[PDB]
Amino acid sequence: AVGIGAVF
Amino acid sequence: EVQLVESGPGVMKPSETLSLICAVSGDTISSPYYFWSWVRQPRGKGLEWIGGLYSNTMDVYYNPSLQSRVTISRDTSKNHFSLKVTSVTDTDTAVYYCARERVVAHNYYGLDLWGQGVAVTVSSASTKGPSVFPLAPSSRSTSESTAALGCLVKDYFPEPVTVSWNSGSLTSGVHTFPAVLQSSGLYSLSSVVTVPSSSLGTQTYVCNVNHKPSNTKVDKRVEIKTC
Amino acid sequence: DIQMTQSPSSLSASVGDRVTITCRASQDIKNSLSWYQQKLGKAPRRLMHHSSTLETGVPSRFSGSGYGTEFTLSINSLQPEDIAAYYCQQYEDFPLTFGGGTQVEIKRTVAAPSVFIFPPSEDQVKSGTVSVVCLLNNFYPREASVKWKVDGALKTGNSQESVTEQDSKDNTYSLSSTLTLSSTEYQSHKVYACEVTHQGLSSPVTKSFNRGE
Ligand SMILES: [Ca+2]
């Protein structure tokens, strides 16, 4: 959900 | 070539402010959908994420164990990503890395990069070049025995020193041991090499110590002791 | 605050064997897990993200599995180029957190150390403090007992050991044991010896010298 796995 | 390169003085007295810069070249710092991180590693131990930011927003995120002391920032005119740590102490000694990693869901073909790391020492010691003592081989035991010789490199600060042998032309059998921090605050190590004992009479052995933090070079010949 | 518990802290296997590292998270992290490899003196390099998606350039002998709270990295055919630390990392929540790490060693055939002792030079003695050095070269496994005996008696508290990384060519270790003394205790004794015990030696090897000859 965060960092390299953030989605915008 | 897209590369991250870190700079900043790494030797601090207790309670100074550490200041490190990570410059990207070959790309723009504003390139979207990268996650930029500062990470640190004490010698022998694991990794600790200090904090970081996404290149497409202006927030920066901090580890709560360090947030009271660190400021992480970004200057797009100079392509700089920055770490500031106030009131450093004994515990902040570590190798500090920056990283730029793709935000995978919006960026599958960008390049994941790391800095080379900067070694940060927090100490009351002053810069000091090393004293070097040769470690002489023992007397030959057999026609075909191997002799060991070396040199001891002590009482220097900060790390690192480099030891080469015969101006780097002798590399087989060389072991340079990791440095140990003494209670005086200074470091020391030994460098050794194994050679054919037959060659002790025909070939000369010199260790070349280079201590770049003090701009010091020491070149010691290692010979068998004359009774 | 999401703890990553990594196990084991170190592991040893022969070339070609199959090894696993496990990592368990203190709370559900779905498949927001990465594995990194760090070679000595180098920056980490990610082996995979999303639990199991290899990065470009990463040999297919590495693989990962897991969803939820438990995760495994596997190395199918352990190679010498795999000597490294390995770290998991979760990225389900800030702050990012890493596992404590696993050190990987290659198990090779037993090889006894060759053992050398180095009396301090006259110039070291002139300087006020001396270091007697005992070297164990090119040996495996790493466990080794090195004791200092001065005039025949065991000396406990002035020595320090230092060990090389496993050699990339022959997978052995070397070791130094350094005995640091002042010039005055050093000159008050005559015989200095280091006694080495190792699985590769059929009984202890002693290397010694008599000060002043
Ligand atoms: Ca060797």
Nearest to B67 by CA among B51, B80, B83: B51
3-state secondary structure of B97: strand
- Angle at the Cα of B2 (from A1 to B30), degrees rounded to 5? 55
As a whole number of angstroms, the distance between CA B178 and CA B42 comes to: 15
Q: Which CATH class is domain C108-213?
A: mainly beta
Q: At C123, which helix (H) or strand (E)?
A: helix C122-126
In chain C, where the domains are located:
1-107, 108-213
What size, in residues, is chain C?
Answer: 213
As a whole number of angstroms, the distance between CA B53 and CA B34 comes to: 8
Structure tokens at C158: 């002035």
Nearest to C88 by CA among C103, C107, C72: C72
Residue found under tokens 């897991």: C66
Bridging pattern class, strands B70-75 and B80-85? antiparallel
In whole angstroms, how far apart are CA C104 and each of B20, B50, B83, C66, C85? 32, 26, 32, 21, 6
As a whole number of angstroms, the distance between CA B162 and CA B34 comes to: 36
What is the number of other CB atoms lying within 10 angstroms of the CB of residue C95?
22
Determination technique for this entry:
X-ray
**Domains C1-107 and C108-213 are alike in CATH topology:** yes
> C122 exposed, middle or buried (CB, 10 Å; 0-12, 13-18, 19+)?
exposed
Neighbours of ion ligand 1 (CB under 5 A): B 173, 194; C 137-138
Nearest to B48 by CA among B1, B112, B99: B99
3-state secondary structure of B198: helix
Contacts of B62 (CB under 8 A, 6+ apart): B50, B51, B70, B72, C95
In chain B, where the domains are located:
1-124, 125-227
What is the number of other CB atoms lying within 10 angstroms of the CB of residue B84?
14
Structure tokens at C47: 């082996």
3-state secondary structure of B92: helix
Q: What share of chain B is helix, strand, coil (3-state, %, to 5)?
A: 5, 50, 45
C184: DSSP letter: H
CB contacts of A2 in chain C (<8 Å) are 32, 91-94, 96
3-state secondary structure of C106: strand
As a whole number of angstroms, the distance between CA B68 and CA B62 comes to: 9
In whole angstroms, how far apart are CA C202 and each of C108, C111, C113, C196, C197? 19, 12, 12, 11, 9
Residue C87 region by backbone torsions, left for phi larger than 0, else alpha for psi between -120 and 50, else beta: beta
As a whole number of angstroms, the distance between CA B179 and CA B23 comes to: 30
What is the end-to-end Cα distance of chain B in Å, rounded? Answer: 59
B64 C-alpha to ligand 1 centroid (Å)? 46
As a whole number of angstroms, the distance between CA C36 and CA C60 comes to: 15
> C147 exposed, middle or buried (CB, 10 Å; 0-12, 13-18, 19+)?
middle
Q: At C126, which helix (H) or strand (E)?
A: helix C122-126
Q: Are B115 and B22 in contact (CB under 8 A)?
A: yes
Contacts of B12 (CB under 8 A, 6+ apart): B18, B88, B92, B120, B121, B122, B123
- Angle at the Cα of B186 (from B184 to B190), degrees rounded to 5? 120
In whole angstroms, how far apart are CA C108 and each of B159, C74, C135, C163? 32, 20, 21, 17
Give the distance, in angstroms, between the CA of residue B49 and the centroid of all CA atoms in the same chain.
19
Structure tokens at C76: 């199918």
As a whole number of angstroms, the distance between CA C111 and CA C142 comes to: 10
Amino acid occupying residue B135:
L
Structure tokens at B168: 């780097």
As a whole number of angstroms, the distance between CA B182 and CA C66 comes to: 44
Bridging pattern class, strands C10-14 and C153-155? unpaired
Q: Are C137 and B175 in contact (CB under 8 A)?
A: yes
B125-227: CATH architecture:
Sandwich (2.60)
Taking an 8 Å cut-off on Cβ atoms, the answer to whether C95 and B189 are in contact is no
C186: DSSP letter: H
Strand partners, B41: B95
Task: Find the chain C residues whose C-beta atoms sit closer than 8 A to any C-beta of A.
Answer: 30, 32, 34, 49-50, 91-94, 96
Amino acid occupying residue B173:
G
In whole angstroms, how far apart are CA B77 and each of B31, B34, B80, C32? 13, 18, 8, 34
Residue found under tokens 């005119």: B77
Q: Are B49 and B94 in contact (CB under 8 A)?
A: no
DSSP string computed for B165-226: EGGGT--TTEEEPPPEE-TTS-EEEEEEEEEEGGGGTT--EEEEEEEGGGTEEEEEEE----
Bridging pattern class, strands C19-25 and B174-176? unpaired
Nearest to C83 by CA among C140, C37, C141, C42: C37
Contacts of C34 (CB under 8 A, 6+ apart): A4, C46, C48, C49, C88, C89, C91
CB contacts of C1 in chain B (<8 Å) are 64
Number of inter-chain CB pairs under 8 A, A vs B: 23
Amino acid occupying residue C182:
S
In CATH terms, the superfamily for domain C1-107 is Immunoglobulins (2.60.40.10)
Taking an 8 Å cut-off on Cβ atoms, the answer to whether B101 and A8 are in contact is no
Q: Cis omega before residue C59 (within 30°)?
A: no
Contacts of B183 (CB under 8 A, 6+ apart): none
The 3-state secondary structure of C13-72 reads EECCCCEEEEEEECCCCCCCEEEEEECCCCCCEEEEECCCEECCCCCCCEEEEECCCEEE
Bridging pattern class, strands C129-139 and C173-182? antiparallel
Number of inter-chain CB pairs under 8 A, B vs C: 102
Bridging pattern class, strands B118-122 and B60-62? unpaired
Nearest to C37 by CA among C29, C46, C28: C46
Rg of chain B, C-alpha, whole Å: 23
Bridging pattern class, strands B118-122 and B11-12? parallel
In whole angstroms, how far apart are CA C23 and each of C40, C68, C90? 22, 11, 10
Residue found under tokens 């290899």: C54
